[PDB]
Amino acid sequence: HTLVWGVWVNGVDQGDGRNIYIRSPPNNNPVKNLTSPDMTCNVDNRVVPKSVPVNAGDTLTFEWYHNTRDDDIIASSHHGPIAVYIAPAASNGQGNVWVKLFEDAYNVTNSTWAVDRLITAHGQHSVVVPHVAPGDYLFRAEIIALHEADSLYSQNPIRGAQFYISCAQITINSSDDSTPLPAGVPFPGAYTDSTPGIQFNIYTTPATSYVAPPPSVWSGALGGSIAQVGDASLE
Numbered sequence: 082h083t084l085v086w087g088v089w090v091n092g093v094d095q096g097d098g099r100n101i102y103i104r105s106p107p108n109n110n111p112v113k114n115l116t117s118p119d120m121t122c123n124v125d126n127r128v129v130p131k132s133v134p135v136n137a138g139d140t141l142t143f144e145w146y147h148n149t150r151d152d153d154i155i156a157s158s159h160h161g162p163i164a165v166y167i168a169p170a171a172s173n174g175q176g177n178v179w180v181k182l183f184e185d186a187y188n189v190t191n192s193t194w195a196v197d198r199l200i201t202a203h204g205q206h207s208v209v210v211p212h213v214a215p216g217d218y219l220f221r222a223e224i225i226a227l228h229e230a231d232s233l234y235s236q237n238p239i240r241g242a243q244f245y246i247s248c249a250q251i252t253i254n255s256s257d258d259s260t261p262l263p264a265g266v267p268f269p270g271a272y273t274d275s276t277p278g279i280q281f282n283i284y285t286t287p288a289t290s291y292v293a294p295p296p297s298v299w300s301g302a303l304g305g306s307i308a309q310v311g312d313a314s315l316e
């Protein structure tokens with residue numbers, strides 16, 4: 082159970098984005114149905130009134146929370162990977178338009194899942210804004226919680242992988258457009274019951290055998306990490 086509060090650009094807090102530049106759902110409940118339109122941008126996907134201005138090479142940081150800002154973020158039971166996708170705003174998330182910019186699943190070095198790291202980072206994870214065409218974008222951050230992913234939703238709707246999905250409206254202003262954005266994948270559509278990483282048992286399989294759902298990270302992606310960039314107590 083987790084939601085995006087807002088974003089930071091280059092370490093500078095853009096302010097509370099809920100229902101403003103984030104297409105926020107009414108609450109922190111997971112999406113589970115792989116075929117639902119809810120997989121795109123969660124349960125209240127509509128245009129919200131603002132969009133965060135960035136330039137290529139900027140660091141764009143999502144900030145998540147559980148109940149209140151900078152709290153425990155997400156229950157530590159919710160082990161799983163984190164991903165960020167991008168699509169042109171013109172699409173409204175439809176079609177084969179989602180390009181992956183970041184993936185983190187299990188870090189063998191630290192023996193930590195992405196979600197575990199996210200807690201330590203106070204909810205913050207970032208991507209470097211790529212050299213795509215100027216214009217309007219949706220960045221879709223996705224946390225997959227695996228604590229009931231030993232079942233499939235399609236077979237048992239009380240269990241299943243849980244998706245915490247948040248779409249931010251981002252305006253890319255300055256960019257040389259030297260990595261024109263490719264075709265991506267559809268949400269719903271890319272994840273199916275057979276997809277690696279959707280059904281997995283985190284209690285018996287070793288985490289080092291986890292494989293995150295494809296697609297793989299686009300080669301034009303400029304990086305990102307799960308790491309606190311700013312202090313919510315102070316700005």
Ligand SMILES: OC[C@H]1O[C@@H](O[C@H]2[C@H](O)[C@@H](O)[C@H](O[C@H]3[C@H](O)[C@@H](O)[C@H](O[C@H]4[C@H](O)[C@@H](O)[C@H](O)O[C@@H]4CO)O[C@@H]3CO)O[C@@H]2CO)[C@H](O)[C@@H](O)[C@@H]1O
Nearest residue numbers: 082083108109147148155156157158159228229230240284
């Ligand atoms: O530990 C592994 C074990 O876990 C079992 O599943 C548990 C989860 O571990 C636990 O984290 C989860 O807790 C949920 C709870 O179900 C929700 O009702 C609650 O929703 C809250 C929300 O958190 C608040 O922010 C909001 O204001 O109120 C709503 C209540 O309306 O969210 C918490 C998580 O934060 O519960 C699971 C069981 O239901 C697995 O099933 C088991 O297989 C694993 O082995």
Ligand SMILES: *[C@@H]1O[C@H](CO)[C@@H](O)[C@H](O)[C@H]1NC(C)=O
Nearest residue numbers: 114115116117118234235238
């Ligand atoms: C999942 O969503 C699909 C497409 O909207 C819908 O037809 C199906 O009823 C859903 N499954 C459940 C259990 O609600």
Ligand SMILES: [Cl-]
Nearest residue numbers: 082111229243
């Ligand atoms: Cl739960």
Ligand SMILES: [Cl-]
Nearest residue numbers: 097099100105
């Ligand atoms: Cl709010």
Ligand SMILES: [Cl-]
Nearest residue numbers: 107108110124
């Ligand atoms: Cl609800």
Ligand SMILES: [Cl-]
Nearest residue numbers: 111112113114
């Ligand atoms: Cl659902």
Ligand SMILES: [Cl-]
Nearest residue numbers: 100127128129
């Ligand atoms: Cl609205």
Ligand SMILES: [Cl-]
Nearest residue numbers: 130131132133
């Ligand atoms: Cl605006």
Ligand SMILES: [Cl-]
Nearest residue numbers: 148149150151
């Ligand atoms: Cl708050």
Ligand SMILES: [Cl-]
Nearest residue numbers: 147152153154
């Ligand atoms: Cl708390």
Ligand SMILES: [Cl-]
Nearest residue numbers: 201202308309
């Ligand atoms: Cl950190």
Ligand SMILES: [Cl-]
Nearest residue numbers: 113238239240
């Ligand atoms: Cl349920």
Ligand SMILES: [Cl-]
Nearest residue numbers: 137212256257
């Ligand atoms: Cl540039």
Ligand SMILES: [Cl-]
Nearest residue numbers: 115116269270
């Ligand atoms: Cl589908």
Ligand SMILES: [Cl-]
Nearest residue numbers: 186291292293
């Ligand atoms: Cl992986």
Ligand SMILES: [Cl-]
Nearest residue numbers: 184296297298
């Ligand atoms: Cl990858």
